[PDB]
Amino acid sequence: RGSFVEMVDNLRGKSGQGYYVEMTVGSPPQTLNILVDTGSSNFAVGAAPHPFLHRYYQRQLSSTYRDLRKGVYVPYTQGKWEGELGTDLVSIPHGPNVTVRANIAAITESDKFFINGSNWEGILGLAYAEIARPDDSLEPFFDSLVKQTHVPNLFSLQLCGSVGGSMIIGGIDHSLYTGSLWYTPIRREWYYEVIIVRVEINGQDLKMDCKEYNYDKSIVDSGTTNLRLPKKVFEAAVASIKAASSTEKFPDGFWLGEQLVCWQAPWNIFPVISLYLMGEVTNQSFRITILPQQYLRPVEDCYKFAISQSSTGTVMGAVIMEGFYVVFDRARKRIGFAVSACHVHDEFRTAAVEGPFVTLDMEDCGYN
């Protein structure tokens, strides 16, 4: 409760490749770097010598592996993986001092899944059983951790935008954030779905039916880079950001993430984005505010516009999370946000989490 020195700084990454944590699977333990992903629910690890991989799970070396004699096939818009289901013993060396028997999908075939040049070999899906594959009977890693140990049912993430950060399993570390935590209800335990109730660009409202913000869902997802916005909201958001900054002109492809843009060694024209999220109390909300620093990503002085359009709803990816300490408070069905002690900023403006605000009709903002 409160202080977890052994877990601080337990994430690494490369800009553009996500954040991963060291884990061990089997007996004797096999060390693997595993992508932290709050927008999926399978613990899926490379188990065959794909050329992009530094290492992979060799089930044959493990005395504690149990075969579930069941295959899984998992396609996405981009690519897919297939593998074999089983269970084995898992630890997190820079996490709690416990070992749990967990489901593992040993990935035996993949396309456009693994990143060439990255340092991770699997994915730790931290969301709920409802979106596990093949079906909701394949219990996720975190539910196994909680069922088999005294670890409380919550974890928190500080993603520092090369990259690093902290995954605190079982608690909150107060050194990772400043000011207060504000909480939004997890609307349904599948993804970490939340409800956005207002959006402002430099404190001007987009003024849309708030149902549009959440069409068909909004989620918090450390396994995606961009702030992704429903097409209609995305149209409104860039129209308003373009206008906000038109002191400078940029090729239009830029706004679609189709070309990059460059300077040397300009931020103050770019506006802040405020998302107000449904609060814990009736008619109460709070707001989180991000900086151009989060939505303009460095590529290597050339940046990518990292807000993009979506047909799967809003996705608050690593772009949003890197401003904030984010507490995934599963025991109470709520996600807390606070200003991260490590967020990328400047002398003028800071990322911010403020409340309470009075917002009426917040349940209308949910899509059904």
Ligand SMILES: C[C@]1(c2cc(NC(=O)c3ccc(C#N)cn3)ccc2F)N=C(N)O[C@H](C(F)(F)F)[C@@H]1F
């Ligand atoms: C399972 C999945 C996934 C994520 C990544 N993520 C990354 O490669 C990555 C790269 C950079 C950053 C950062 N910052 C974070 N993540 C790669 C493959 C993959 F299948 N997880 C999520 N949430 O969304 C992906 C989707 F549903 F979109 F397909 C997909 F489900």
Ligand code: NA
């Ligand atoms: Na328990």
Ligand code: NA
């Ligand atoms: Na603090």
